[model samples]
Target chain A: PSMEDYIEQIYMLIEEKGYARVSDIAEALAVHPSSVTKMVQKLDKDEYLIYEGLVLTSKGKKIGKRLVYRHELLEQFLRIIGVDEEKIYNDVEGIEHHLSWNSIDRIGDLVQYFEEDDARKKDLKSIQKKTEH
Target chain B: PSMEDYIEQIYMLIEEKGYARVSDIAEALAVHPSSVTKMVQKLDKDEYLIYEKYRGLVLTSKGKKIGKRLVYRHELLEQFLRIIGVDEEKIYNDVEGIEHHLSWNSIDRIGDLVQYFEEDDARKKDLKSIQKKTEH
Candidate 1:
């Protein structure tokens, strides 16, 4: 997901603020500005983004949206599974890119299942506490 | 680097047969055979494995040992998801997404979590309802 991080963060930034600048992406990703430029150039080379005008192609936009959705889905899955707050960032960042469409869909089902029963949710909290070793 | 995919497949191929050919790796990964030869050369340079006309492929002691651990890393996550009541048909497909991405410690921690759930039959029963609800 390291490579995909560039596009995902770009999509998120654009959604939040209508446009993305190099400095903003660098700050959002906690990556150096030089590193951001290098990846942006690579994305440009791959035709995902335009370097001069800073426009995303249809292909880029499509993939960027998919990555963002996957990113948020993985974050939700981590929380639902009682994967601790401290562990969420590394786990989501590490695993989101690799997850296939099937995994995401099935995981969404599981999350919905949890929501179907409030009693199940309370039991899950106690289970999480017991397993905290 | 495509090291893990290459290394793990090569290791398994060698275990299955006596060695691996560049073509075999190409077929396994569905990459171009000649391009796989190029990739083999990269691994060769890294000294993880060596390619030869007669021997086909040879792994250094380092590379030979890594494949099983990488493979285990995958299966660990694979089983952990199953314990959580994800769909069985979708399990391996989902695992491939995560196998290479998580750190070893993360996967181990996930496995530890699975054991606790296994012990908690009530939680497992709730997951069973998840299975009942999810077959669409």
Candidate 2:
């Protein structure tokens, strides 16, 4: 679970900040640096991540990007159901691991449906407004 | 949360059996009749269900149908994860809430990818054949 979380977080952090480091991940996730090192080492062993002198490996970057995709999808799904921010954050963390590739595709289709359907978009917009208040 | 689960379960039961009742639901979900009563009442208030006495609970076609959709989405998501597959029946039980509306789309895309990959499962067939030879 921590590996998945770290991979996903690193993906998002890099997208937002263009890089991720052991310390940065530790801080963002509120874990100790030593924990981050252990997890990073695991990722490195899996060949899903590479790190040398603070630079992330291509494999690590790829996995990170996939995690970002998963996060974005989960976040969108949570929003449609009127979930709160704190709940959204927690739920996404919990749900990300179990989500499947096929399921992700279905969600993509739904996203397209929402985007293209005026009525659905309106509904989403109205809900989004309500959630903000 | 109960609302979502009830709605989803009702939908699945209806799909499989063409009807759902408070007793059936209570038994399926392992809850008390009274608790089912309480939840049925709430769903009724929300216009998601209809019920009376021992006639049992029935979802308005609308609520029941929508609930089915949510369950399908959630089940598919849980089936996707290796860890989730361990508790396959239960994670969908727990993660029903906070699944979000938009995330469904991205998952749809991933489903497409897996269907096309057809790689691992295809390999599994050969492994099964190998096992057969060993057994013989």
- Please, what is the whole-model Cα lDDT of each candidate in the order they appear? 0.76, 0.62
Would you give me the overall lDDT of model 1?
A: 0.76
Please, what is the TM-score per model? 0.63, 0.46
**lDDT of model 2 at position A132:** 42
**Per-residue lDDT tens digits of candidate 1, residues B1-136?**
3678888888888989888877788888888887777877888898898767788789999887788887777777777767765567877777766677665546655655566567777767766677677775
Q: Find the candidate with the highest lDDT and give its number.
A: 1
| Candidate 2 lDDT over residue span A1-133, tens digit each | 4787888777777777877877889998899999998888887788766766344578777777787887787678555534555556665775676655645554554444444445644644454454346
Model 1 misplaced regions, further than 4 Å = A1-11, A14-73, A76-90, A105-133, B51-54, B117-122, B130-136
Interface DockQ per candidate: 0.29, 0.04
Candidate 2 residue B87 C-alpha distance from true site, Å: 17
How many clashes in candidate 2? 33
